[PDB]
Amino acid sequence: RNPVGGARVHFSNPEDAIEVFVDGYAVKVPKGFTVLQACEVAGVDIPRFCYHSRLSIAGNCRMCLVEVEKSPKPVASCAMPALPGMKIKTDTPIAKKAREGVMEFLLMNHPLDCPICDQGGECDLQDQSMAFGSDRGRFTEMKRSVVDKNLGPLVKTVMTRCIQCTRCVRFASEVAGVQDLGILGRGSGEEIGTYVEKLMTSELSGNVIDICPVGALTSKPFAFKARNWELKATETIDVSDAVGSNIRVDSRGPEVMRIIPRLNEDINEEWISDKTRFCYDGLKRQRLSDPMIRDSDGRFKAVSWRDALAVVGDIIHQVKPDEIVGVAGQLSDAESMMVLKDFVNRMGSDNVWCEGTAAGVDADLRYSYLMNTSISGLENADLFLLIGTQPRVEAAMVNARICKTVRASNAKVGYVGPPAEFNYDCKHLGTGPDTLKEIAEGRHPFCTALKNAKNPAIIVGAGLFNRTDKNAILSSVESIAQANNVVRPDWNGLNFLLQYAAQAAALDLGLIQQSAKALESAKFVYLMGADDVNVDKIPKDAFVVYQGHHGDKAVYRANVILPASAFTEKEGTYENTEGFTQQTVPAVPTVGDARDDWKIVRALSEVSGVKLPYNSIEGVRSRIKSVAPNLVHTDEREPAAFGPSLKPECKEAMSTTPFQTVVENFYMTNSITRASKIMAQCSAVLLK
């Protein structure tokens, strides 16, 4: 037999492995597993309400009660450790009678509002009541009730349906890191709340909607919109940040209803951020859908695809080859970037780069822009040194795993950067480059802990790449990494955290800027969804083409608008901060007359008299295989090959300007969230 849900049990050694009898079947489990986990290994799935595999154990609901031979009373399988020779019994009359007793108690003060509950067809309470519960209720007296409380614009609260499993409290205390929610009162009158009127401001606050087994906590934007049985589930990934969380897009027809997490032990681990969860609103607002060209007076007229391509292909032949600039966006997939790079290269130009970290970064060795320690590998670190990075706003899931490591392994975090708010205890070593020199030379008290740490983890931020002293800072960090051993064959500690989903693929494909003063001396600028660049740098004589899916400040300056498809409407490959390649699956049809980015660039190449050998999406991936052959080997865990020793000696001087913050508004980062309605009421009341 197989474990429930295909769960993988990791035996550290064959010696430390006890034997238990779940239902007369011999089961081998390590010392430390509970009765519930041992039953999960043996294919038996125990009912549970308050137990979550990512939260601390708290035997409240008493629903997982089983029978043990040497026990006078039923034991809570979630908290009872497994002992060698223990004989568990799950399908005995004792365990049953316990389960229908507990279900009867749980369904005693519960309100009769299943039809109006947003957890209607997806509730654990009623699903287990049908299976493990009884048939008739003996309760006739008056039920209790509580008032509903406002927790913000994201979590809708109907606390009459609370079953008091305290999973939200445990999540807020352990995973979210923001202690604002707790169990208040004593007895049947105990309530979940903040006592004072405050709103959930955590970036991972939306995850309480999923951990809640009942409809007490539900999404407010996705209130009454649809039922779960009406929704088609597509397993896609994130493009909002460079973490690449595994999500599950649910849609009802040609529009997306909601986004919920998806299990990935190596990237997100059942959690997603509030920017991931509620970004689906902007996918249906201010969407570019028709090709458009400005008129003489200055207005955009809707035009057919043939004429817009004709105009851009006619203007591209009148500018000098070095006058052509192509800028990729943060939401671009690898195929479109490869097509754009090929197109610009054939025209005679070499100025192709991405929105963010594209200031001249050397992507020559691939360890200098990747999390050389895997995200899941950060759980073995003993000391985190965050050099000029704020993972709470940049990569929210990396921050979640750092908080996990700090609260479980008692790790130490040293932060060098601008003042910010952390959900874990951190020592503010400094605020600028001089702190790095202080660390390098020594005698700093944090250096003692750094050199006395078995597995240190230095996490440099992508914002350290737009500075003029980038090489000096990267040399100081490498000197710290070498002097205080963090990069060894058995453990690699030097990490670089990117902020945009397209940065990793762009750096792998060689999309690095050549000239710093390239967007000032340009005449034809192809903004391939790059609206996060300051268009005021572009000269007023330049012919700007904006190829994207949403309207922003770049649209008000573009001469030709080519509509594009979003990440939920195309097949694209995205690379994580750790170098893991994943693919998005189309979920909803493209809106209007919009096309995939690579298709639009290839058609523009054809109209501009430039032949591109490939003609299909499979042709692009073959071309990518000759440039970054690891972008086609998706779902492979390929580690880095070389180390920091190959980099040439660079004797520059570190500047004195303190580090800056790259993300000011966490809810306003990309163009999809910038066009969303939820992210406005979230950036207006939740941000301080």
Binding site: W305, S565, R595, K599, R602, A603, V607, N615, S616
Partner: protein, 112 residues
């Protein structure tokens, strides 16, 4: 009459293909009269059509698949012999028949 037993080798499959082709060719005169195909199509264009179908289905090497194909073709032939199908149907199936393909498909729709 009865459905023949399943073949055992490729030679028997080829023999059945030739027998079916000959039967279909002998069925050509009947179709030209049952349906007013006299002043429509030459008596050899249809023959070429059946030959083309046999030839573009000629990469099969599984005798069972060949026998099933022959059986389906014989069913189609028997249906056409009867007045079961409409007149334009056979004329819609049995008649023999610049920038870039990608660019035309791009101008047409996003879904290739």
């Amino acid at each position: 009459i009865g459905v023949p037993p399943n073949s055992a080798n490729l030679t028997e499959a080829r023999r059945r293909v030739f027998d079916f082709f000959r039967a279909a060719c002998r069925s050509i005169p009947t179709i030209m009269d049952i349906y007013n195909l006299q002043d429509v199509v030459a008596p050899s264009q249809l023959r070429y059509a059946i030959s083309a179908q046999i030839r573009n289905n000629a990469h099969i090497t599984d005798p069972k698949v060949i026998d099933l194909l022959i059986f389906k073709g014989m069913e189609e032939l028997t249906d056409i012999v009867d007045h079961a199908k409409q007149r334009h149907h056979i004329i819609g199936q049995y008649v023999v028949g610049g920038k870039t393909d990608f660019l035309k498909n791009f101008y047409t729709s996003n879904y290739f």
